[PDB]
Design a protein around this ligand. Structure first.
Ligand SMILES: *[C@@H]1O[C@H](CO)[C@@H](O)[C@H](O)[C@H]1NC(C)=O
Ligand SMILES: *[C@@H]1O[C@H](CO)[C@@H](O)[C@H](O)[C@H]1NC(C)=O
Lengths: 413, 412
């Protein structure tokens, strides 16, 4: 068979350098393993390498060792072509459904294997796509069911780096699709950022943005230190779960979760990621990492720019960002008060379902609640994905769309 | 000697019925004990007894037994005359410094005793006075020092019902003034509301507002069920501390604290509150109460009105929540601008160890509030919650010019 991959960075902006650095590093790792460029589809906004703030024009790095990972990465879906619609069309292997981009798709055969890696922002039941796009978990599961039904592959492995990423699969991912999934976090935890300015081992001092994400660099650094003909998918999962837990300190670490067909964990990793002949296998028998969560990276980036000195212009941008977050947080809190009463709003909106249950029972209701909210309160933006469990809980409570319209009108109009 | 009292409700509005009900109940208790009306000064906005929402016009009750406590209460300082300036002038006993009101003051003699009871809203280092007035703790301590210096009394007992009320005395109340103080809560705890609609023992069903406050009804119900010629100030403190703790469940109770001269705890309570002749032979000196948080009572009152009705009430709830969010967000943003994103909240929210003053420079505290309100608008009663953030900005060494810049960016 043939090995294929789909690598997706769901964000943009220099502050989010790390998501595109993670995806570029994954591309280089797969090419070194012998996967062919024609079988790897890359989604990256592509605004980082030549960004005016990049201290190394034309270069992207993903760890303090400073090796460029940008040269040679294909421009399959970049800019406004990085959309959920193109991602689904690419996975399905239907070139007629793609809009723009290179036209490269996963037109795979039954004997082939596929590896999907996403890095970005997210929230309960959702992943980000650039410029305020939201990708819903059930729509992604639906694409996997369609791909499986058309006999497009033998096995698939999916790695997802995003906040509350366990919520994209919990209670909804079937185990009969020949798909194995791991996520950076459980359904109620944040994802963590690594290689930030001021941390040790020291990233190059010219960088003002973080270089990578914890779970992402954990799997990539693990692959590029083992002979992948001998390391199994299970061995990588355990090593990534250990590193991402950050010495089991869940105040600065997360629980890596697994979903889908666990029989795939017995497979050798080279069947999905290739084999790099240069790698000297490092036997199994590292230091605690200084990390920040995805949601905190933005203000830290702006504050670093303010401290490195236009000085009052950065302070105004920080104020606008904080005010925007406060507007979204306050509007959601207020909707809970109007729907359930003071003292009952927060418990309803913030309650987390028992393990194993889906985030929401009706995913079309979830999309409608977001639509009604944004029509009165404005776009959720990437930050607003944090509030997706509040919208799911309004759906699950039995509150009607007409009642949500009334509460949003009072809260925001 | 002569026994004097000053009773103050620091709030207004039908939602705050309880603070005036507590003060009216205290007045009746003191009159039953033989204190004279001429020696009791009452501060109450006086908007409750005849309020359009009051189901018993001209009546105020302070517990589910429904006994009126309003009839006969004097109108010394009401409406716009309930001010910190008049409270200070009354305590000092200087009628020429009073503006409006009856002119009654505590013109006490060296042999006299004084009892002060305040019930209201508050915050770290501050108490409320009606219509967005803030009374600072050090200004109240200063009045006590002045009154002591002029030999105006033998001993004084002060009971304070307000959120974070321990912060009004911690690190600043001297023990050499012949003044003993108890507070409903410690310096970092809220105070609790009793007799709310829907709770048991059931208040009369026609009430949509809470009837009293936990620490306040604890001391008053204790006083009126005992012979005060035998009960000491210490016995009342221990009984009030036990009841206010609500079976030591500090998720629905608070820590009653004591400050000042603890030698006064050995005194019989009748020397301050009088003796009710009907209590002579009562036995010598309970169920868990359902209580509501003092800052939570407002939205619960509006929601009860909404349930018993209306889109106009929902709009009022939205305006209230949006206003609180504006104040909370502006304060949080100022902390980010002054200290940076991962440091603002720890600086603004850090609580000093017990026994330390809230702020080292009280004039700086007033200046920070002044600068904030000039850009962000009035703190209002709710905004008193943020007084520890302003104190922490002062204590951190941040300059007034830096506070001006941060407030201008956050609110202008
Ligand atoms: C996994 O392997 C076991 C043992 O062969 C088998 O019983 C099970 O059905 C397989 N998993 C799935 C998804 O069916
Ligand atoms: C309290 O009484 C004790 C004697 O029991 C005395 O030593 C102390 O100075 C008194 N306190 C004050 C503040 O006078």
């Amino acid at each position: 068979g043939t090995r294929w991959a789909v690598l997706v960075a769901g964000s943009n902006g220099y502050v989010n350098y790390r998501h595109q650095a993670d995806v570029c590093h994954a591309y280089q790792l797969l090419i070194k393993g012998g996967l062919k460029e024609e079988n790897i589809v890359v989604f990256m906004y592509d605004d980082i390498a030549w960004h005016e703030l990049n201290p190394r024009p034309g270069v992207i790095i993903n760890n303090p060792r400073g090796e460029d990972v940008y040269a040679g990465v294909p421009k399959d879906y970049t800019g406004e072509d990085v959309t959920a619609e193109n991602l689904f069309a690419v996975i399905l292997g239907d070139r007629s459904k793609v809009k723009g981009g290179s036209g490269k798709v996963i037109n795979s055969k039954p004997e082939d294997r596929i590896f999907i890696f996403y890095s970005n922002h997210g929230g309960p039941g959702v992943l980000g796509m650039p410029n305020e796009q939201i990708l819903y978990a059930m729509d992604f599961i639906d694409v996997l069911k369609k791909k499986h039904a058309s006999g497009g592959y033998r096995e698939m492995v999916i790695y997802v780096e995003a906040c509350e990423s366990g919520s994209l699969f919990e209670g909804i991912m079937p185990k009969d699709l020949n798909v194995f999934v791991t996520t950076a976090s459980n359904a109620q935890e944040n994802s963590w950022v690594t290689y930030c300015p001021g941390t040790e081992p020291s990233p190059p001092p010219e960088y003002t943005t973080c270089l990578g994400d914890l779970y992402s660099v954990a799997w990539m650094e693990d692959s590029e230190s083992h002979n992948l003909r001998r390391e199994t998918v299970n061995q990588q999962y355990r090593s990534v779960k250990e590193r991402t837990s950050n010495f089991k300190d869940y105040a600065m670490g997360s629980h890596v979760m697994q979903y889908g067909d666990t029989n795939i964990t017995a497979e050798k990793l080279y069947l999905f990621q290739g084999f790099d002949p240069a790698t000297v296998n490092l036997p199994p028998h590292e230091a605690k990492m200084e990390v920040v969560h995805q949601r905190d990276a933005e203000l830290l980036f702006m504050w670093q720019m303010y401290q490195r000195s236009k000085k009052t212009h950065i302070l105004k941008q920080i104020a606008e960002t904080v005010k925007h977050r406060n507007h979204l947080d306050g509007s959601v809190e207020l909707i809970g008060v109007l729907l359930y009463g003071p003292g009952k709003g927060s418990p309803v909106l913030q309650s987390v379902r028992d393990p194993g249950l889906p985030l929401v029972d009706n995913w079309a209701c979830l999309k409608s609640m977001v639509r009604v909210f944004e029509s009165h309160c404005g776009s959720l933006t990437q930050y607003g994905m944090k509030h997706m469990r509040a919208f799911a809980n309004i759906c699950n409570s039995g509150v009607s769309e007409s009642s949500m319209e009334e509460a949003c009108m009072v809260a925001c109009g």
